[PDB]
């Protein structure tokens, strides 16, 4: 029973990664903590993908606590792909040593998604049900071994001089203002919960009747179904680009609306500053549509605004105003 603070590093608000150590002697890795997946992998010495030679590669041979599982790992995100071999070893996440933890050793990471990525591997934080066969999610090994004070992990996020933070076993109230509002997780796979509606001046632009959304730190934007996100891009002032995309006039924030996510009777506004990422002169929408549709993904755009707490104990998501 212990608590752990993982400083998260922020690259261009699109990737949040912290440091972790694998095996004995400990080998160091940066890993994006992803609440939208349940597999923990790191590059390994068996991987000869460019993404692998330009990132840190775990060497199981150098680790004595390493235990080969033998079972393949292959994961498809919405953005990226990795194939791996499964094994066991000791992961030190901060001050929590997570013994005999199933970790994927990447074999091939085709594509360029991880290649130009800041971090080496991903550490899924979703439910076990999302985890690959043979694979046990990291927080899950922590709970079963009772290494966390409470079966809760909390995320805070963003920028400069700077300090994003993942906390394990606890919640840091200094990262949020107001009170934490607990949203029940409906479907335990993703950190999925119901969003009552999406309003723009009390008007529902999207998410009519209610819709399902997942709190996903590994998603940079705020993804919603095509039609709905369209109606949002037009309801705000965005335009479609000239080499594909949606743009926002940076000088126009003051005149643009607040996009309020209602979750459990409580309002989660996203100001034009939150839903707008600026590249010095050029502002784009933090709203991304899904080629298809259905589930809304509340990414680092929402997470940056709302200190999120993932409670495995009670299958709650606590939401509060980020500091």
């Amino acid at each position: 029973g212990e608590v752990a603070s993982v400083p998260l590093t922020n690259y261009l608000d699109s990737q949040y990664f912290g440091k972790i150590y694998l095996g004995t002697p400990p080998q160091e890795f940066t890993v994006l903590f992803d609440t939208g997946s349940s597999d923990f992998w790191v590059p390994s010495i068996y991987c000869k993908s460019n993404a692998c030679k330009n990132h840190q590669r775990f060497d199981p041979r150098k680790s004595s606590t390493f235990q080969n599982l033998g079972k393949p790992l292959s994961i498809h995100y919405g953005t990226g792909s990795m194939q791996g071999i499964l094994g066991y070893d000791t992961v030190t996440v901060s001050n929590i040593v997570d013994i005999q933890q199933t970790v994927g050793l990447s074999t091939q990471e085709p594509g360029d998604v991880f290649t130009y990525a800041e971090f080496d591997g991903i550490l899924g934080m979703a439910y076990p049900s999302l985890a690959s066969e043979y694979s046990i999610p990291v927080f899950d090994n922590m709970m079963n071994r009772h290494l966390v004070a409470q079966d809760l992990f909390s995320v805070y996020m963003d920028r400069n001089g700077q300090e994003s933070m993942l906390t394990l076993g606890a919640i840091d109230p200094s990262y949020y203002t107001g009170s934490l509002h607990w949203v029940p997780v409906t479907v335990q796979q993703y950190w999925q919960f119901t969003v009552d509606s999406v309003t723009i001046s009390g008007v529902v632009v999207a998410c009519e009747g209610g819709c399902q959304a997942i709190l996903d730190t590994g998603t940079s934007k705020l993804v919603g179904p095509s039609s709905d996100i369209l109606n949002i891009q037009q309801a705000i002032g965005a335009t479609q680009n000239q080499y594909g995309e949606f743009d926002i006039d940076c000088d126009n924030l003051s005149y643009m609306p607040t996009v309020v996510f209602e979750i459990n009777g409580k309002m989660y506004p996203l100001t034009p500053s939150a839903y707008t990422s600026q590249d010095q002169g050029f502002c784009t929408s933090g709203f991304q549509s899904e080629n298809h549709s259905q589930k809304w993904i509340l990414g680092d755009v929402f997470i940056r605004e709302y200190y999120s707490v993932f409670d495995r104990a009670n299958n709650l998501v606590g939401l509060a105003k980020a500091i």
Partner: peptide, 4 residues
Amino acid sequence: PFCX
């Protein structure tokens, strides 16, 4: 944007 990345979609973990």
